[PDB]
Amino acid sequence: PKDEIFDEILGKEGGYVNHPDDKGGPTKWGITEKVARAHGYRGDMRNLTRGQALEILETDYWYGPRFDRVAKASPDVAAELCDTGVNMGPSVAAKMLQRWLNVFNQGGRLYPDMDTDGRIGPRTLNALRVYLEKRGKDGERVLLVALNCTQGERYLELAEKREADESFVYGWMKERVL
Amino acid sequence: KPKDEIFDEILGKEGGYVNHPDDKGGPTKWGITEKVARAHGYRGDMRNLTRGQALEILETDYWYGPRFDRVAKASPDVAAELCDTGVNMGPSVAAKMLQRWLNVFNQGGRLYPDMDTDGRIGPRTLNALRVYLEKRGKDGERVLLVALNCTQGERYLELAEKREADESFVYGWMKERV
């Protein structure tokens, strides 16, 4: 599901565009020179390969945030976090999970409230496993709907500020109907 | 989900006059406080409030007053969602969510200009709903209901975080939408 997410971001073609050294720099495979260099790329951006671009994406939006560990407990939750993180930021996505796990812990019966720090840590992963163990697959389904509600309200607010296209948010809701 | 079932579930089969000492509301029957009953022109004893007077008061505050009945002429399903939201959070909270979504989905003002997100359903809000439903069709209505559910779910999160909503309610509310 993550592979599909990144394979859709990395189009069939590099699309090398040379923006100002300051304003983004040269970009290929959606990677700016600045981001590439910060991930140890030293070549010309005209010769950046899809593979190293995918490594940068998997690092920033899957492994760095530790969505791969979430996937160990719930492939579906991790996929939603990953898709959320590429559009809004991985820490925004991680905070949504933490917020929901705190409200659904039954006044701290299942586990104590965690920090909503937006980092997937051992306490976040333990809370997710206890939640999934106590509430079972119905729990997992409830959590996914809840995450979708916080994603959609953030797309609303992004669209109000013009950081997201109307068509994009209409299409995202359309994908979630019956 | 329909309006009659929403009110028929709030009004039980039994009045249950409980005489709170004014502070914690009460005298209350059929979920109606004396304060609300008298503010609706009921002058009898609160012990003798009829179910029918109580239904008239609910219909007044949570269906006609907010103009959800006029919404229902355009979309029975959107009106029923607003009515359910309004009884839990306030009808103007519900009405404002509709205005925000109709503004994002107006295609940069192509279908109709941005309306005031004042939380009051006026002739321009109902005109915008009818144009939206005529341009985007039944798929439009389904999309708008998903979007309204996202803003509802995220407001329940906020309410639960402030302790203004029971965790059980919000889990229950997600589960019924699984």
Residue numbers in the entry:
A (entry chain A): 11 to 188
B (entry chain B): 10 to 187
Lines from the paper:
Sen1395, a close TtsA homolog from S. Enteritidis, is unable to complement a ∆ttsA S. Typhi mutant for typhoid toxin translocation because it exhibits different substrate specificity. To gain insight into the mechanisms of TtsA substrate specificity, we solved the atomic structure of Sen1395 to 1.9 Å resolution with an Rwork of 0.20 and an Rfree of 0.24. The crystals belonged to the P1 space group and contained two monomers per asymmetric unit. The structure aligns very well to TtsA with an rmsd of ~0.7 Å over 161 aligned Cα pairs (with 64% sequence identity). The positions of the conserved catalytic residues in both enzymes overlap reasonably well, which is consistent with the observation that the catalytic domain of TtsA can be replaced with the catalytic domain of Sen1395 and retain full function. Despite the very high structural similarity of the two enzymes, notable differences on amino acids located on the surface of the putative substrate-biding groove could be identified. Notably, while the surface of the substrate-binding groove in TtsA is lined by largely uncharged amino acids (Ile116, Gln120, Gln164, Asn166), the equivalent surface in Sen1395 is occupied by several charged amino acids (Asp117, Arg121, Glu165, Asp167). We propose that the charge differences in the substrate-binding domain between TtsA and Sen1395 confer upon these enzymes their different substrate specificity. We found that, unlike TtsA, when expressed in S. Typhi Sen1395 was not enriched at the poles and showed a uniformed distribution around the bacterial surface. Taken together, these results indicate that Sen1395 and TtsA exhibit different PG specificity and that the substrate specificity determinants of both TtsA and Sen1395 are contained within their carboxy-terminal half.
